[PDB]
Design an enzyme around this catalytic site. Structure first.
Site, PDB file in Angstrom:
ATOM      1  N   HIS A 171       1.257   1.446  -5.751  1.00  0.00           N
ATOM      2  CA  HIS A 171      -0.160   0.661  -5.794  1.00  0.00           C
ATOM      3  C   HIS A 171      -1.067   1.882  -6.117  1.00  0.00           C
ATOM      4  CE1 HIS A 171      -3.857  -1.040  -4.676  1.00  0.00           C
ATOM      5  NE2 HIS A 171      -4.249  -0.410  -3.825  1.00  0.00           N
ATOM      6  N   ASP A 199      -8.667  -1.302  -7.920  1.00  0.00           N
ATOM      7  CA  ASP A 199      -8.168  -1.697  -6.685  1.00  0.00           C
ATOM      8  C   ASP A 199      -7.937  -3.331  -6.706  1.00  0.00           C
ATOM      9  OD1 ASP A 199      -6.720  -1.271  -4.041  1.00  0.00           O
ATOM     10  OD2 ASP A 199      -8.885  -1.240  -3.184  1.00  0.00           O
ATOM     11  N   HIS A 254       0.798  -1.152   0.085  1.00  0.00           N
ATOM     12  CA  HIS A 254       0.042   0.197  -0.046  1.00  0.00           C
ATOM     13  C   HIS A 254       0.951   1.228  -0.184  1.00  0.00           C
ATOM     14  CE1 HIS A 254      -2.815  -2.951   1.518  1.00  0.00           C
ATOM     15  NE2 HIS A 254      -3.805  -2.382   0.959  1.00  0.00           N
ATOM     16  N   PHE A 304      -8.390 -16.237  -3.440  1.00  0.00           N
ATOM     17  CA  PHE A 304      -8.776 -14.773  -3.136  1.00  0.00           C
ATOM     18  C   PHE A 304      -9.366 -14.594  -4.877  1.00  0.00           C
ATOM     19  CE2 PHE A 304      -7.492 -10.428  -4.220  1.00  0.00           C
ATOM     20  CZ  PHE A 304      -8.242  -9.606  -3.147  1.00  0.00           C
ATOM     21  N   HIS A 355      -6.799   7.211  -2.418  1.00  0.00           N
ATOM     22  CA  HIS A 355      -7.688   5.986  -1.932  1.00  0.00           C
ATOM     23  C   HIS A 355      -6.837   5.348  -0.594  1.00  0.00           C
ATOM     24  CE1 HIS A 355      -6.059   2.755  -4.141  1.00  0.00           C
ATOM     25  NE2 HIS A 355      -6.596   1.890  -3.220  1.00  0.00           N
ATOM     26  N   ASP A 356      -5.641   5.133  -0.697  1.00  0.00           N
ATOM     27  CA  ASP A 356      -4.710   4.511   0.187  1.00  0.00           C
ATOM     28  C   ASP A 356      -3.664   5.482   0.952  1.00  0.00           C
ATOM     29  OD1 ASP A 356      -5.780   1.852   0.643  1.00  0.00           O
ATOM     30  OD2 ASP A 356      -4.623   1.149  -1.120  1.00  0.00           O
ATOM     31  N   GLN A 399      -3.999 -16.991  -3.368  1.00  0.00           N
ATOM     32  CA  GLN A 399      -4.232 -16.342  -4.459  1.00  0.00           C
ATOM     33  C   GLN A 399      -5.383 -17.021  -5.119  1.00  0.00           C
ATOM     34  OE1 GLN A 399      -3.402 -13.316  -5.239  1.00  0.00           O
ATOM     35  NE2 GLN A 399      -2.344 -13.521  -3.169  1.00  0.00           N
TER      36      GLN A 399
HETATM   37  N1  8BR Z   1      -2.903 -10.351  -4.992  1.00  0.00           N
HETATM   38  C1  8BR Z   1      -3.543  -9.488  -4.366  1.00  0.00           C
HETATM   39  N2  8BR Z   1      -3.899  -8.398  -4.676  1.00  0.00           N
HETATM   40  C2  8BR Z   1      -4.618  -7.353  -4.226  1.00  0.00           C
HETATM   41  N3  8BR Z   1      -5.180  -7.814  -2.895  1.00  0.00           N
HETATM   42  C3  8BR Z   1      -4.962  -9.130  -2.473  1.00  0.00           C
HETATM   43  C4  8BR Z   1      -3.827 -10.143  -3.120  1.00  0.00           C
HETATM   44  N4  8BR Z   1      -3.973 -11.108  -2.305  1.00  0.00           N
HETATM   45  C5  8BR Z   1      -4.708 -10.934  -1.205  1.00  0.00           C
HETATM   46 BR1  8BR Z   1      -5.146 -12.119  -0.065  1.00  0.00          BR
HETATM   47  N5  8BR Z   1      -5.211  -9.911  -1.370  1.00  0.00           N
HETATM   48  C6  8BR Z   1      -6.250  -9.003  -0.218  1.00  0.00           C
HETATM   49  O1  8BR Z   1      -7.252  -8.137  -0.776  1.00  0.00           O
HETATM   50  C7  8BR Z   1      -7.220  -7.013   0.094  1.00  0.00           C
HETATM   51  C8  8BR Z   1      -7.469  -5.837  -1.110  1.00  0.00           C
HETATM   52  O2  8BR Z   1      -7.624  -4.397  -0.707  1.00  0.00           O
HETATM   53  P1  8BR Z   1      -6.274  -3.562  -1.345  1.00  0.00           P
HETATM   54  O3  8BR Z   1      -6.216  -3.607  -2.808  1.00  0.00           O
HETATM   55  O4  8BR Z   1      -6.857  -2.299  -0.859  1.00  0.00           O
HETATM   56  O5  8BR Z   1      -4.889  -3.617  -0.491  1.00  0.00           O
HETATM   57  C9  8BR Z   1      -5.652  -6.724   0.284  1.00  0.00           C
HETATM   58  O6  8BR Z   1      -5.755  -5.898   1.410  1.00  0.00           O
HETATM   59  C10 8BR Z   1      -5.506  -8.040   1.071  1.00  0.00           C
HETATM   60  O7  8BR Z   1      -6.016  -8.234   2.174  1.00  0.00           O
HETATM   61 ZN    ZN Z   2      -5.663  -0.057  -2.862  1.00  0.00          ZN
HETATM   62 ZN    ZN Z   3      -7.294   0.215   0.981  1.00  0.00          ZN
END
Ligand code: 8BR
Ligand code: ZN
Ligand code: ZN
Length: 338
Positions: free
Chosen positions: A87, A241, A83, A295, A123-124, A292
């Site tokens: 980013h 984001d 962050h 996610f 935003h961050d 991942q």
């Molecule tokens: N490859 C990735 N890119 C972005 N966020 C990810 C990620 N893998 C993971 Br697990 N995350 C999660 O998704 C959230 C997205 O929030 P941000 O993109 O604002 O950081 C992250 O804070 C983190 O907790």
């Molecule tokens: Zn962000």
């Molecule tokens: Zn954020």
């Protein structure tokens, strides 16, 4: 003004080559930072505003713009692995590309375009490299100020706007009072929407809209009222984001290494302070690949498939890349079951 950037002609030439992709998903923001003395957010934002003539439209001098941007960028922490301004720059540029998606042509006013890119840029800002929960659990002064609700997101907003008051930083000086009011509203809305705890409701509302989805004879989306436009805007910034997994694997992998390092860093802080180590914050018990894949399956893919639906077929290549990236990680998962 290349001079405020401290860039010489040789790196300016490198930058010129990189910026050929300014309007492309394939832009490499890492190279951009590399040729701009690590001021990727100001560089990309200046390129974006020039490209969209936003400086002319809103009467923002290059001086005021660069001054504010360099100040804002400096409030991102360069020692926070993910962050940071890199980013923010990535998200601003991704939002820039998304705004020009065929399906959304002529839909947004210039103020809305300004709001979305600004939102993305700030935003961050001043992110400490730890989650809202960490701030809450440590009885952080920030959590107490914002009553444990969207702590960081509220702070990002407060800082982004507060920095407008520093010397030669008011980039909104020449907007009418009504314009400032409207932009503020939209920016606050979009940044608060970046709080991952609002994801599900954002996606739910987004789908509910893709149902009543309207288009024109040419296929272009139809968003005549404010509520609908802002809803598309807030989801757009959220998508930018969460765009890391939709980028070329070379980029995605760098973003993943960063987010994992930031998590481990928080894990280290929790251990240091005698707190229980959060999930995915322990490098000795975290499954990068599994994380991942999970996610993408439960968060990213469900979001992008819906966005792709809203602007089909504009986002098809992004969805294909996302899916390739997911399978690549699913294959990289350490060879179990032994
Ligand atoms: N490859 C990735 N890119 C972005 N966020 C990810 C990620 N893998 C993971 Br697990 N995350 C999660 O998704 C959230 C997205 O929030 P941000 O993109 O604002 O950081 C992250 O804070 C983190 O907790
Ligand atoms: Zn962000
Ligand atoms: Zn954020």
């Amino acid at each position: 003004s290349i001079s405020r950037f401290g860039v010489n002609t040789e790196n300016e030439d490198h930058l010129a080559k990189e910026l050929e992709d300014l309007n492309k998903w394939g832009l490499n923001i890492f190279n951009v930072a590399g040729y701009s003395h690590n001021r990727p957010l100001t560089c990309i934002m200046y390129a974006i505003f020039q490209e969209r003539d936003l400086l002319k439209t809103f009467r923002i001098s290059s001086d005021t713009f660069i001054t504010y941007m360099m100040t804002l960028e400096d409030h991102y922490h360069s020692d926070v692995a993910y962050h940071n301004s890199l980013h923010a720059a990535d998200v601003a540029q991704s939002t820039h590309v998304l705004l020009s998606t065929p399906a959304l042509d002529a839909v947004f006013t210039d103020l809305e375009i300004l709001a979305a890119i600004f939102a993305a840029a700030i935003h961050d800002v001043d992110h400490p490299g730890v989650s809202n929960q960490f701030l809450i659990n440590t009885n952080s002064e920030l959590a107490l100020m914002y009553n444990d609700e969207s702590v960081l997101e509220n702070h990002h907003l407060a800082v982004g706007f507060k920095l407008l008051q520093e010397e030669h930083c008011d980039i909104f000086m020449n907007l009418t009072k009504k314009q400032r009011q409207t932009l503020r509203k939209m920016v606050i809305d979009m940044v608060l929407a970046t709080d991952m705890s609002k994801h599900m409701s954002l996606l739910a509302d987004l789908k509910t809209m893709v149902e009543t989805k309207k288009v024109t004879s040419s296929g272009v989306l139809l968003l005549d009222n404010y509520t609908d436009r802002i809803q598309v805007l807030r989801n757009m910034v959220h998508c930018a984001d969460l765009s890391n997994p939709t980028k070329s694997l070379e980029l995605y992998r760098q973003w993943t290494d960063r987010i994992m390092e930031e998590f481990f860093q928080q894990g280290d802080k929790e251990r240091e302070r005698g707190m229980e180590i959060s999930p995915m914050c322990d490098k000795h018990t975290a499954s990068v690949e599994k994380s991942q894949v999970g996610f993408i399956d439960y968060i990213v893919h469900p979001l992008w498939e819906t966005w792709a639906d809203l602007v089909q077929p504009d986002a098809q290549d992004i969805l294909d890349t996302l899916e390739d990236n997911r399978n690549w990680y699913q294959s990289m998962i350490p060879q179990a079951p032994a």
